[PDB]
Amino acid sequence: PFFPPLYLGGPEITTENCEREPIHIPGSIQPHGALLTADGHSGEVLQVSLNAATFLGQEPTVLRGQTLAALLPDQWPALQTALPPGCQDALQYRATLDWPAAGHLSLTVHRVAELLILEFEPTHALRNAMFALESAPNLRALAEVATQTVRELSGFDRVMLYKFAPDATGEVIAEARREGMQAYLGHRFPASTTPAQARALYTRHLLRLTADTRAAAVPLDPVLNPQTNAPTPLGGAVLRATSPMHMQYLRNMGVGSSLSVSVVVGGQLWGLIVCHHQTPYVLPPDLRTTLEYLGRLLSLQVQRKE
Ligand SMILES: *C/C=C1/C(=C/c2[nH]c(/C=C3[NH+]=C(/C=C4\NC(=O)C(C=C)=C4C)C(C)=C\3CCC(=O)O)c(CCC(=O)O)c2C)NC(=O)[C@H]1C
Ligand code: NA
Numbered sequence: 001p002f003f004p005p006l007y008l009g010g011p012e013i014t015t016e017n018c019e020r021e022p023i024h025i026p027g028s029i030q031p032h033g034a035l036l037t038a039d040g041h042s043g044e045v046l047q048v049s050l051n052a053a054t055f056l057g058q059e060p061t062v063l064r065g066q067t068l069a070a071l072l073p074d075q076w077p078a079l080q081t082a083l084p085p086g087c088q089d090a091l092q093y094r095a096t097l098d099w100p101a102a103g104h105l106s107l108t109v110h111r112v113a114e115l116l117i118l119e120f121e122p123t124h125a126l127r128n129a130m131f132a133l134e135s136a137p138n139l140r141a142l143a144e145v146a147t148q149t150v151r152e153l154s155g156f157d158r159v160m161l162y163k164f165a166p167d168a169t170g171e172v173i174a175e176a177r178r179e180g181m182q183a184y185l186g187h188r189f190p191a192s193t194t195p196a197q198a199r200a201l202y203t204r205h206l207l208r209l210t211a212d213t214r215a216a217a218v219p220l221d222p223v224l225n226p227q228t229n230a231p232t233p234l235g236g237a238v239l240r241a242t243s244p245m246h247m248q249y250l251r252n253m254g255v256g257s258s259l260s261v262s263v264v265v266g267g268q269l270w271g272l273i274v275c276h277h278q279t280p281y282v283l284p285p286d287l288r289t290t291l292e293y294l295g296r297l298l299s300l301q302v303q304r305k306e
Contacts, residue, residue, distance in 0.1 A: 027219060030210065037116065
């Protein structure tokens, strides 16, 4: 089983126990957005990221305890409609908020049990991308096209297709990258670099990222969900804080921003679309949704070719 999280007295992770880290419940987020949790019946705001004033204009102390009806009157009824108690876990509510003075905010909401999890962050290609992946006549061509298409759409410095072997080691089997960058084609890596509980999570929650590999995580306050006195499920929150071990791996590779999308075949994790940028980089929200879609399409095409 998982260790308890650090804030419940669990051990800190080392190379002896990579696979025990409860990466889905870090109690913290990345600083490029804000996260609120709210009761899924009353809309009471229960937990607030400590940075929330940066995005929402009000201090966490002020936000906590208010209802979504009071805070987001234009969205609460639509949210009640879209994400009722007992709804399918994969459902999402999305809106664009135009009231911030210096931009627009993307709001993304999902339900986990009795909690709503609200994420706020600033905010023919599709036909062509779909066609390119569906048409590729063999797995090599498919991998080449997928990496090139994801790079073109996203702008990432490096986009790889990373395939797991039967011993859970991985290999870069295709790549698209910025002019002059060193090729990572053919490089192979130990199984511990993507440990077993990460691979399991990635069979369920198909995209994750680290937008700035040097940025400190921002706690949720309070850290435990008051409904349960237990950790808040964040596996489905893009803004979730990344494992420290993995962020250090990335820094030591010269990666400022990382993002991957699962390739799932027969319900197993076949591989990953792995994206790197040398500097920090916040892939825009709409482009994340596009990459998720392309991951699903790639997954089915890989299943077919095999
Ligand atoms: C003892 C623990 C270790 C550790 C843990 C760890 N790693 C991940 C997630 C990823 N690891 C990845 C590995 C690579 N990315 C690359 O570009 C290459 C090679 C060129 C490799 C081998 C990748 C792709 C991920 C997924 C996340 C991402 O795309 O950025 C986790 C889970 C992170 C999280 O979701 O919070 C964990 C716990 N890695 C180790 O090397 C050891 C020290
Ligand atoms: Na979770």
